Design a protein around this ligand. Structure first.
Ligand code: BMP
Ligand code: BMP
Lengths: 218, 217
């Protein structure tokens, strides 16, 4: 599995190049894995992945929550890996063919898929939560090795860890701004994602160091 | 939304030259283009403004928005800043995520389309069982524009029943995925067509042919 420094992944959701680069550079001594999503990509272009690699040499997870039909999913994955992303995040709720399309491209291109099972926000309870255990089991059956599950619901995160097993890699958003607890989340997740609690801080480096201090025994 | 010939081009070519040429070849037949991530991630968001400059077409950004509310808001803002007239949003992540998109659309003078059931086989696993409830959620939220599947006209008809004749409904899956344009337009206001046009030997003739087949509609 990927070796994520300090079990901490930066969610870089700032929407201009200058700020995104400044903050990422400020925390680079603490974090070697950066999640780049559509807020930044749709504002600055896919070449932002190239610039981050050039400036920081951090691993890049493209958080694109891929959620289309198989044919379109393949195109999205090919474009994303072409730009230099190490991995891409894909929704499971559109079903097994859509996930398999992404897995097939990742295999061909030598990259990785993360399967998003349950989400961390309140609305996830409406439809996603009731499908999540089955989505996870589907991932295991398809050979998925990397997963995303919610920091905001420790009980659900624990179940998802059970389903995927200890050898699978699990990352988790929702600690900090959304109310999850970093230490509790790391009982089950390999790494936590942190966005606003870092990038909105007066001193992002101090914020990152503080999160790390709070989980130092882990 | 007044869609010329009830036909929306799904422009999923992945290079600018081909995308512009093919769209130009069929411009006399359409005034509405759906641009998705295959083109945007290959050529950049500036492609939307370029389509508006070249064709003066309406642009639907098919971004299948499916994040938490805070991130959805950012995605919609970036998308509308790029000149999209409308954005397609998944309903599966729940009401708060949809509302976040509705808020930005209202602020910027744009439309949200709610995707309720998808057209591909995998949709049967999780989405289909939630789809009627997703549609009722749209009604509750005041959503007026919807997407449902050409490949399952009985499901498309049910979606139309739920949202009412006043709502606007567009539908992918005719052509390449096996749906029939005419049958689909019994229930949808417009059909989406991608590969059946942009991969055809002659895209203009392909568009003309689709339109000939639904001439009475
Ligand atoms: O279930 C999930 C899945 C996510 O990827 N995310 C993403 O993780 C990040 C959370 O950032 P924050 O720490 O600011 O709440 C955002 O990029 C969000 O889009 C999430 O919050 N919940
Ligand atoms: O349920 C859905 C929803 C979609 O937006 N789409 C989109 O509609 C278009 C269908 O294109 P095509 O005619 O080549 O099958 C694609 O851009 C696809 O991403 C779909 O096929 N099924």
């Amino acid at each position: 599995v990927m070796d994520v420094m300090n079990r901490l992944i930066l969610a870089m959701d700032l929407m201009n190049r200058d700020d995104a680069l400044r903050v990422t550079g400020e925390v680079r001594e603490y974090i070697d894995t950066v999640k780049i999503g559509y807020p930044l990509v749709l504002s600055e272009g896919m070449d932002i992945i190239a610039e981050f690699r050039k400036r920081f040499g951090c691993r890049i997870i493209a958080d694109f929550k891929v959620a289309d039909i198989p044919e379109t999913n393949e195109k999205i994955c090919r474009a994303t890996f072409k730009a230099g992303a190490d991995a891409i995040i894909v929704h499971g709720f559109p079903g097994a063919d859509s996930v398999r399309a992404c897995l097939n491209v990742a295999e061909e291109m030598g990259r990785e898929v993360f399967l998003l099972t349950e989400m961390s926000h309140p609305g996830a309870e409406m439809f996603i939560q009731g499908a999540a255990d089955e989505i996870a089991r589907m991932g295991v059956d398809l050979g998925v090795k990397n997963y995303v599950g919610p920091s905001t619901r420790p009980e659900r995160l624990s179940r998802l860890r059970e389903i995927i097993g200890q050898d699978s890699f699990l990352i988790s958003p929702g600690a900090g701004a959304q109310g999850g607890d970093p230490g509790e989340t790391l009982r089950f997740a390999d790494a936590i994602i942190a966005g606003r609690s870092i990038y909105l801080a007066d001193n992002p480096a101090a914020a990152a160091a503080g999160i790390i201090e709070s989980i130092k025994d882990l």
